Design a protein around this motif. Sequence first.
Motif, PDB file in Angstrom:
ATOM      1  N   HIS A 243       0.681  -0.861  -0.500  1.00  0.00           N
ATOM      2  CA  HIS A 243       0.180  -0.417  -0.008  1.00  0.00           C
ATOM      3  C   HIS A 243       0.786   1.789   0.193  1.00  0.00           C
ATOM      4  O   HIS A 243       0.895   3.111  -0.895  1.00  0.00           O
ATOM      5  CB  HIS A 243      -1.344   0.192   1.569  1.00  0.00           C
ATOM      6  N   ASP A 244       2.149   1.692   0.801  1.00  0.00           N
ATOM      7  CA  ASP A 244       2.919   2.649   0.515  1.00  0.00           C
ATOM      8  C   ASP A 244       3.731   2.721  -0.411  1.00  0.00           C
ATOM      9  O   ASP A 244       3.782   3.586  -1.453  1.00  0.00           O
ATOM     10  CB  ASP A 244       3.786   2.169   1.652  1.00  0.00           C
ATOM     11  N   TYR A 245       3.859   1.257  -1.055  1.00  0.00           N
ATOM     12  CA  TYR A 245       3.958   1.201  -2.536  1.00  0.00           C
ATOM     13  C   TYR A 245       3.232   2.129  -3.628  1.00  0.00           C
ATOM     14  O   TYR A 245       3.746   3.381  -4.105  1.00  0.00           O
ATOM     15  CB  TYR A 245       4.608   0.229  -3.624  1.00  0.00           C
ATOM     16  N   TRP A 246       2.129   1.412  -3.481  1.00  0.00           N
ATOM     17  CA  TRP A 246       0.882   2.276  -4.668  1.00  0.00           C
ATOM     18  C   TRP A 246       0.723   4.014  -4.647  1.00  0.00           C
ATOM     19  O   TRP A 246       0.870   4.755  -5.031  1.00  0.00           O
ATOM     20  CB  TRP A 246      -0.235   1.279  -4.421  1.00  0.00           C
ATOM     21  N   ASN A 247       1.001   4.252  -2.667  1.00  0.00           N
ATOM     22  CA  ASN A 247       0.503   5.387  -2.581  1.00  0.00           C
ATOM     23  C   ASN A 247       1.542   6.102  -2.629  1.00  0.00           C
ATOM     24  O   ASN A 247       2.035   7.434  -3.146  1.00  0.00           O
ATOM     25  CB  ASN A 247       0.538   5.762  -0.932  1.00  0.00           C
ATOM     26  N   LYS A 248       2.907   5.669  -2.789  1.00  0.00           N
ATOM     27  CA  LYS A 248       4.247   6.401  -3.720  1.00  0.00           C
ATOM     28  C   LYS A 248       4.288   6.616  -6.026  1.00  0.00           C
ATOM     29  O   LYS A 248       4.888   7.025  -5.435  1.00  0.00           O
ATOM     30  CB  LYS A 248       5.254   5.761  -3.520  1.00  0.00           C
ATOM     31  N   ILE A 249       3.486   5.418  -6.259  1.00  0.00           N
ATOM     32  CA  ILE A 249       3.005   5.089  -7.651  1.00  0.00           C
ATOM     33  C   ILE A 249       1.704   6.335  -8.056  1.00  0.00           C
ATOM     34  O   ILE A 249       2.112   7.049  -8.945  1.00  0.00           O
ATOM     35  CB  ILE A 249       2.410   4.167  -7.655  1.00  0.00           C
ATOM     36  N   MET A 250       1.208   7.019  -7.175  1.00  0.00           N
ATOM     37  CA  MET A 250       0.054   7.520  -7.326  1.00  0.00           C
ATOM     38  C   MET A 250       0.880   9.034  -7.862  1.00  0.00           C
ATOM     39  O   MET A 250       0.159   9.535  -8.693  1.00  0.00           O
ATOM     40  CB  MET A 250      -1.051   8.181  -6.548  1.00  0.00           C
ATOM     41  N   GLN A 251       1.980   9.686  -7.466  1.00  0.00           N
ATOM     42  CA  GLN A 251       2.404  11.091  -7.809  1.00  0.00           C
ATOM     43  C   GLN A 251       3.379  10.619  -9.271  1.00  0.00           C
ATOM     44  O   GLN A 251       3.696  11.683  -9.354  1.00  0.00           O
ATOM     45  CB  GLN A 251       3.586  11.244  -6.283  1.00  0.00           C
ATOM     46  N   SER A 252       3.159   9.524  -9.603  1.00  0.00           N
ATOM     47  CA  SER A 252       3.711   9.703 -10.875  1.00  0.00           C
ATOM     48  C   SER A 252       3.587   8.903 -12.316  1.00  0.00           C
ATOM     49  O   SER A 252       3.844   8.829 -13.132  1.00  0.00           O
ATOM     50  CB  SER A 252       5.209   8.219 -10.587  1.00  0.00           C
ATOM     51  N   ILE A 253       2.114   9.184 -11.876  1.00  0.00           N
ATOM     52  CA  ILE A 253       1.174   8.494 -12.822  1.00  0.00           C
ATOM     53  C   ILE A 253      -0.735   9.311 -13.207  1.00  0.00           C
ATOM     54  O   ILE A 253      -1.290   9.181 -12.063  1.00  0.00           O
ATOM     55  CB  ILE A 253       0.409   7.391 -13.249  1.00  0.00           C
TER      56      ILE A 253
END
Lengths: 19, 42, 138, 149, 147, 157, 157
Positions: free
Chosen positions: F131-141
Amino acid sequence: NSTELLDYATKLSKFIWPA
Amino acid sequence: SNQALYEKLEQTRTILSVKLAELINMTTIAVATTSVMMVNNQ
Amino acid sequence: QALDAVRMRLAQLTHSLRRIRDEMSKAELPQWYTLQSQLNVTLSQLVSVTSTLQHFQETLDSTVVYPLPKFPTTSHESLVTTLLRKKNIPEVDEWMKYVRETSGVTTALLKDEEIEKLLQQDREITNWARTTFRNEYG
Amino acid sequence: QWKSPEWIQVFGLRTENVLDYFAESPFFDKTSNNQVIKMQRQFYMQLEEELMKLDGTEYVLSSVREPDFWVIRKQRRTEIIPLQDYYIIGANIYQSPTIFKIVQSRLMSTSYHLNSTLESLYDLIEFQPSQGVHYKTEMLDKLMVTSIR
Amino acid sequence: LVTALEVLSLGRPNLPTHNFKLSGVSIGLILQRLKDLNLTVSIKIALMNIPKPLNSYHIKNGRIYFTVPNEFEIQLSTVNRQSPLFFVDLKLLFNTEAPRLEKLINEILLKLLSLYNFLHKYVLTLQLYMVHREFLKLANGGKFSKS
Amino acid sequence: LEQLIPIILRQREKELQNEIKQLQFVKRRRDMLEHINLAMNESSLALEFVSLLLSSVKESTGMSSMSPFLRKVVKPSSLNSDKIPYVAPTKKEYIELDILNKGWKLQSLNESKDLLRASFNKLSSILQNEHDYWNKIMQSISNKDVIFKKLLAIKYG
Amino acid sequence: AATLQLGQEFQLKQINHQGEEEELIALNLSEARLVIKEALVERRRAFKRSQKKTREKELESIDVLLEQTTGGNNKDLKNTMQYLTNFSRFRDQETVGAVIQLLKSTGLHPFEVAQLGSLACDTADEAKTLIPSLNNKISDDELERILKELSNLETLY
């Protein structure tokens, strides 16, 4: 010493394994 | 490709729930050891 | 008649466990689908043997089996004792008695004469549980 | 169990001596025809012939192998319906097999061992939602090939 | 009386010295054996016609270690040791250069004079393929004009 | 003497002459081999016992599961085929077996609870990190940030 | 007809490509599926080798992976695999070996034992009516026994 073997080894000839 | 997720996901849900009820109905009833490993495998 | 299938299912048991031995003999473990599949085959063989065994438990207890004069017993004697050893392995009997000690009912309650009521409560809770599953699935 | 080697060397290992040995065993019944014979003495085939006259339990020999494997068949005469089958192996008393129980034992052992493996493998499982389950000089050779060529 | 002397010496050693598994449950002299192997090789090598680039060598403890300079951050030196001697012309050898190389030298060695030839050739190739290995890096790197 | 140099070489250079002159998962693999080994032993012994027990009433059909030694040891049309009265129902009338059943089933329950809790821990941690990984991806797409494709690649120039 | 008198190429006497004599090979709808499904696997290995330089879903999926191997000109073989699989009750070549051991124990013709293993019957009259060649060549009780052992060898997959 041999004196213990000449008197102790004589009792080793008569002995069947323990049962 | 979404229908494979419908059938597959729904099958996993039915196996999960129905297999759970079969589990609890087999935990409550070398037969004992076979029950141990059947329950553990469920 | 039943043991004609017991020997075949135990043969597939030995083959399956040997295949698991070959899969575990490697340095790195291979795929998990083959491992879980072979394990399911093993469990299927064990359950398949125990089912027929429990189905024919009154017939096997009504006969005796011991070798005939046509048997080379004058050369080997301990082997014949191993082929008809009713005595279990000390691990299954040992941990069996240990589990019997860690079952919540011992012989002290045999003196109290009180088990059928607990069994009745158990079966009653089976009924209640199955009804709750009826509703929750409804 | 039941070990009595002192009575083996004083009488031998014959049929009658075996009848006396099993007569001394705790499995001997007081209502047997042999005990009736012992009561008549106070008041090999010939023994069976004498046992044809009395009524009660019996210990008839089955299979003759010398000197080790003999079958002792306890049978309650009426037509003769048997009871249990005893076997002498190395001056020892053996019980009836009752196949089923023995068939349980071995299976139990196999089951427990399988359980051991089933746990050990579950200790090496790596759960990933995208990757699944995980389990935690040539150029010089060609130089020498083109060198020797 | 043997068993009497045995129980006098604590135990009965004929039982473990005769039983196998029971025996399974129950330095300066070795050093001198290596020096005796060089005295046999040194006279046959001493008689044969050693080539000129191999006149210099160092007899090491149980071997003959001879050198000749090259490159590749090392020196073309090898260790030789064998056993037969009755044949004067051909001399079987057991050498090592200081998995494929081991079986290659144990292959060309099991047939004295041959060793050098092969080695020489190898070195040559490794000097060519030195050149090749350099030219490639010249062809990729500072290659301005290719014509 | 050619048999001493190899063993001494495996067990045990001039500096040594002067020195003596002055004077995690492999274990789990082995556990697999041991457990599956014992299972193979008990399974093989069980098979041999079933076949030899079979050889009493056999028409040689069940002697086919034997070894070359058991075939020359046992003989067809042999052993005892006698019958004894039933012993199973007299033992079934007793209530000494239900105790063991209840005990084993209870132990099954406990083990199931333990394993389910362990899996709860593992899946909990996995859900946290992922979930931390996804929350980090949201700023990249979205539609301004560009992204491409078993990992995610990205072209710069 | 069905009177143990087939055609010329289907006679009891066959000749292989080496020049030796061989009996006619008759297969029932049990191992006949494991032989096609068997050889298609090694055919897939042969197709992936030169490339370098519940019971119905797996059936159709494997038939698709093997359909990609062939040139899309033999789908009647895959529909035949669905036919056999939908009409097959056997599995594993070991049990098939047992079935051959039970069929060859009576000493019948390969076509006859093929019709025996390929048909599901409960009584002997069914086997004698569906197979006109078998009506007195073998006892009825033995056929019923074979159907009993087979009934114990079939398992719902």
